[PDB]
Amino acid sequence: NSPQEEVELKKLKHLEKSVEKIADQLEELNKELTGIQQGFLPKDLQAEALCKLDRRVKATIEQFMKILEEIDTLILPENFKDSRLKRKGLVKKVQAFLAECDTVEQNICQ
Amino acid sequence: GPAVGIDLGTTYSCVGVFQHGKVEIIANDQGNRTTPSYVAFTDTERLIGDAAKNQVAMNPTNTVFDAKRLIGRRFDDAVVQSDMKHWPFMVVNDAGRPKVQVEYKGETKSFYPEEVSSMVLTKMKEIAEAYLGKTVTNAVVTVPAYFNDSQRQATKDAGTIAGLNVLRIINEPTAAAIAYGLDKKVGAERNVLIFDLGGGTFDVSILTIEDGIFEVKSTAGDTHLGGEDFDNRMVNHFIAEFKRKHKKDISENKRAVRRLRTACERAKRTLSSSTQASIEIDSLYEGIDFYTSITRARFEELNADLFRGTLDPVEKALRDAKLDKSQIHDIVLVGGSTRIPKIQKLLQDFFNGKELNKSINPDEAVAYGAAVQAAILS
Ligand SMILES: Nc1nccc2ccccc12
């Protein structure tokens, strides 16, 4: 438990915070995806309504990617175990959200 | 306000102001000393610079760049047709002239290359006004030495459309030479070589400076050779390494490749100050954490032919300028890629131990000289 580790752990707390902010946008898109599928819109209008969400899903994908690129700049030595665990869990969370992002893409602009 | 110096680069543009006996390189709204020469068109807005580049993976077909490769050129130009292959956006014919075609606010809209470069210049004018807190109209805009009458007039028109009073259109190698005050240097005529490796292009120029008057003696270099080629060789090395270490091919996972590329781009930069670079990319491909390293020596070997290949246009420039390598008074380094110690060593070894001009940031050297010229013309 070195002080120099708190610098790295704080960086990861800010990165985790930023991930929650992107995760909130993904959840709103999910509420709109389900919102069109179980909504009042006519069949032909639904296809357009679903595809209009394409800019936002690509925006959410890009943001998660920029977060990964930032996590990928961190050099965490072997002793910094708590920081390597936070970095593994955050990368895994972002990648599970990216799989959810891809699921939304599969259900739109078909 | 005062007059500014603008380097209107292919990938990144740069703006400088001469103040308090020194050139100050103006930072943009995102805090960057260079602004990407990018223009994005969307359903709701037109983005310029960093904002345009940040959404390039979201809206590739409607994000324009490399307009400098099209400005003042004919549609049927060999350069135009060969670069069209790599652009996600559309380049269309309009009575022999190229236009960029994009979807903007729901409708199909076309723009001339100088209309796009004028949006990029309006941004650099704004950047300068945001720093100085004063209105900027007067500017010195740089162009490469090989640019013709049409290519120069197109750039001059891009400044006119941007609301600038273009004080002068000057050559990039001349600007870099002004930055090092090679024209103030006492004595007879000075034969100066400019080594420009940066901004996706490579240009070797030979100048003659006699009593403040510059003369272009020769121009050589590869139009499509830069930092991106030195990155590829590192990316290939790592994909081959992951294959040996884990028997997995990451080359088809676009996101994994991008993660490796970004780490490679940074590791390259580190190898200019350090001898070793370290990469740690968790769950790169199929949950596999990629923990690796790359020495400066290794990077140099992977790019050995490419780095050496920078001496071919140096020799071709000397042949064409009818000069011996011993007859060169000054060597100037410009463009981010000149930062590589091997590039500097090979060029210094070739010139039998002559000290290169490398103090001024290679990314900023052309804007530095343009800012001196803007203050001289005022
Ligand atoms: N080291 C290095 N090599 C090429 C381009 C660069 C750009 C900016 C900083 C460092 C660079």
Numbering used by the authors:
A (entry chain D): 151 to 260
B (entry chain C): 4 to 381
Give verbatim lines from the article.
Critical to this binding mode is the interaction of the aminoquinazoline N1 atom with the Ser275 hydroxyl group, as was confirmed by the 1-aminoisoquinoline fragment 22 in which the N1 atom has been replaced by a methine group. This change resulted in a loss of binding affinity measured by SPR, but surprisingly a crystal structure of 22 bound to HSC70-NBD/BAG1 could still be obtained. The structure, which contained two independent HSC70-NBD/BAG1 complexes, revealed 22 interacting with the Ser275 hydroxyl through either its N2 atom, or its exocyclic amine group, consistent with its lack of activity.
The 70 kDa heat shock proteins (HSP70s) are an abundant family of ATP-dependent molecular chaperones, involved in many cellular processes including protein folding, prevention of protein aggregation, modulation of protein complexes, and protein transport between cellular compartments. HSP70s bind to extended hydrophobic sequences in newly synthesised and partially folded proteins, in a manner dependent on a cycle of ATP hydrolysis and ADP/ATP exchange. HSP70s consist of a conserved N-terminal nucleotide binding domain (NBD) with ATPase activity, a substrate binding domain (SBD), and a poorly conserved C-terminal domain which terminates with an EEVD tetratricopeptide repeat interaction motif123. The two main cytosolic HSP70s are the ubiquitously expressed HSC70 (HSPA8), and the stress-induced HSP72 (HSPA1A)3.
